[PDB]
Design a protein around this ligand. Structure first.
Ligand SMILES: [Ca+2]
Ligand SMILES: [Ca+2]
Ligand SMILES: [Ca+2]
Ligand SMILES: [Zn+2]
Ligand SMILES: [Zn+2]
Length: 159
């Protein structure tokens, strides 16, 4: 019923990089996360380095200029606005978390897949196998796959 992007070419921009990770690893994690959803839809995502992107990717802590403060280490890991102009689509990651490429800390790739779900208009799944389940779970990110419920969800919006 809700907001959806009404175009197939979507842009994203990385506003700032967490110091927790190698810059190339931030780039690859977010890229790979967008690929997850483009693999099952007609959407295409392109990274831009200047200008206004649809989806601004931000690492920030506490109160950071929207109405939804972060809460320090623990609890909230990230949030994302649904499709829309301005802040719509934007995905914010709590810098008080310790972001990684692996099972330690909080995996940036897995969090971004979930956050980007929301940026594309998905809500939460009650299916504990689904990436859009509300609770973070680390799974070997090599071999990661969307569930049938996640696929049904995003195809209900875009496909
Ligand atoms: Ca936006
Ligand atoms: Ca937090
Ligand atoms: Ca951090
Ligand atoms: Zn925010
Ligand atoms: Zn969520």
């Amino acid at each position: 019923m809700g907001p959806v992007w009404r175009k197939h070419y979507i842009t994203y921009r990385i506003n700032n990089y967490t110091p927790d990770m190698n810059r190339e690893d931030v780039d690859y994690a977010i890229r790979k996360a967008f690929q997850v959803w483009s693999n099952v839809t007609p959407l295409k995502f392109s990274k831009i380095n200047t200008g206004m992107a649809d989806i601004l990717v931000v690492f920030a802590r506490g109160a950071h200029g929207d109405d939804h403060a972060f809460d320090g280490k623990g609890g909230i890991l990230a949030h994302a606005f649904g499709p829309g102009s301005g802040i719509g689509g934007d995905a914010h990651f709590d810098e008080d978390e310790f972001w990684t490429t692996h099972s330690g800390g909080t995996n940036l790739f897995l969090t971004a897949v979930h956050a980007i779900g929301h940026s594309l208009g998905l809500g939460h799944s009650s299916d504990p196998k689904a990436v859009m389940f509300p609770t973070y779970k680390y799974v070997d990110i090599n071999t990661f796959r969307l569930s049938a419920d996640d696929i049904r969800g995003i195809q209900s919006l875009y496909g």
